[PDB]
Structure 1
Amino acid sequence: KQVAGTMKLELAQYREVAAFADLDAATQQLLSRGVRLTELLKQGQYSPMAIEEQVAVIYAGVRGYLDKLEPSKITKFENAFLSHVISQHQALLGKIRTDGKISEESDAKLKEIVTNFLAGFEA
């Protein structure tokens, strides 16, 4: 809920506005976000994900950290990012799973993980 809360209506408004569209700044930002969340919700078959892992991926998109990343690279980022968190930040993922929530501390922790990993990936 902390990451998906208002995403459904947002995506329905995004689709309407993508079809309708000197676009103003709010329209542009709505387009940039929806195009990216769309990539993030793509998923292959036969590898259903644990909830804490879905949270970490969606966080990346709904907190704005991928807004400047090229849309065609989203799926590859997500696959690399998830391997990295699973491999080196099990504790963080366990905490989100066990607390069933994103604490203030888990949130500061994810933020540096995402931004630093993203700059690397973009290198």
Structure 2
Amino acid sequence: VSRVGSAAQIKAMKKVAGKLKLELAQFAELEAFAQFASDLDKATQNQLARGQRLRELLKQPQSAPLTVEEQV
């Protein structure tokens, strides 16, 4: 966590980064917990696939930084 919070981010990135953090919260729950049996809510069809795509998007190549607009 960052105690300076979303005050330090850009006015551009703040909305989309808040949405992304909430997306990762949802995915972290749905992966760390149940829905291995198909389910009532039946993930991989609502949030699990997109959360896996997001988390495997978060990985950078070794020492290849992304610019501001690129990462936005």
Query: Same fold per TM (> 0.5)?
Result: yes
Report the Cα distance in structure 1 between the residues aligned to 2:55 and 2:61, rounded to whole angstroms.
Answer: 14
Root-mean-square deviation (Å): 1.8
TM-score by length of 1: 0.38
Report the Cα distance in structure 2 between the residues aligned to 1:10 and 1:50, rounded to whole angstroms.
Answer: 23
* Greater percentage in helix: 1
Counterpart AA for 2:18? G
Counterpart AA for 1:11? L
Q: Larger relative contact order (C-alpha < 8 A, sep ≥ 6)?
A: 2
Identity value in percent: 56
Unmatched segments (≥5 aa) in structure 2:
1-13
Higher mean C-alpha displacement, 33-42 vs 1-10: 1-10
> Match for residue 18 of structure 1?
31
TM-score by length of 2: 0.59
User: Aligned pairs, how many?
Assistant: 54
Counterpart AA for 1:39? E
Counterpart AA for 2:25? A
Unmatched segments (≥5 aa) in structure 1:
56-123
